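User: Need the bound-state model for 1,1-diphenylethanol:
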Amino acid sequence: SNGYNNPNVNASNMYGPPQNMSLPPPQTQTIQGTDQPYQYSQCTGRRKALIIGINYIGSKNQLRGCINDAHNIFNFLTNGYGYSSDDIVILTDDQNDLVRVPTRANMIRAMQWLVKDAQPNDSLFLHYSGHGGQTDDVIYPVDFETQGPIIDDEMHDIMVKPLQQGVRLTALFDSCHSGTVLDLPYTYSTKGIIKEPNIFSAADVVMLSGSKNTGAMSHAFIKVMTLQPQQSYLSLLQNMRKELAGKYSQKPQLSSSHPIDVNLQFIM
Ligand SMILES: CC(O)(c1ccccc1)c1ccccc1
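Assistant: Bound-state model below.
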């Protein structure tokens, strides 16, 4: 009998969250044996999103569905989750406004914009679909041939390092080899903790990515949250894995800047 690993199946044929699921606690949390507080966001504040989809149109490794992944996430967030269009920057390489092209400079600037002046209980969302690689994990702006990639340490320095206690950053990567792209120290799978520090931000950073067309992670995330919006961190992972099974060769993982009580409700 294992309700962690073997959850019951509900009327929608999906894995059920815990019978009694709590919202993340408002109080400052601490880690035992050290002085490193953190705080879950209540997500009652400002909601902003940066969404990036790159197809590398015209190049030798043009991709087919990344721009579409970006549009899917834009639609999902604006229509479901209170992200206003004035509060979203979407960068894609098939449209006609240069300042919205995902060049390296525009991406870096947008990353700075996303987290600028972020207050406790704000909810920030980052989505990336394009080429990913490991050298460090890195991502590839449309002009990477001349400007190079953006590496994990820089993305951590721009988007994680400045965050105040209790600011949520939720990140969703559809790219390959992006599991450590924000240098986060905790990693969770459907089967439990798979990485944690052996001994830190006080913010609330969580990220979803896949490990071994269209974006598998955004596909799974959007379908699960559309059909059954009530999920814990763990049941969200389990249900995404269930949706991906057979069709996709990817399994979802959750990384975080702090320990997660995976039975808490996943909110945004
Ligand atoms: C998206 C766009 O095709 C582009 C520009 C630069 C690199 C890749 C793609 C564009 C946008 C505005 C003006 C010119 C070209």
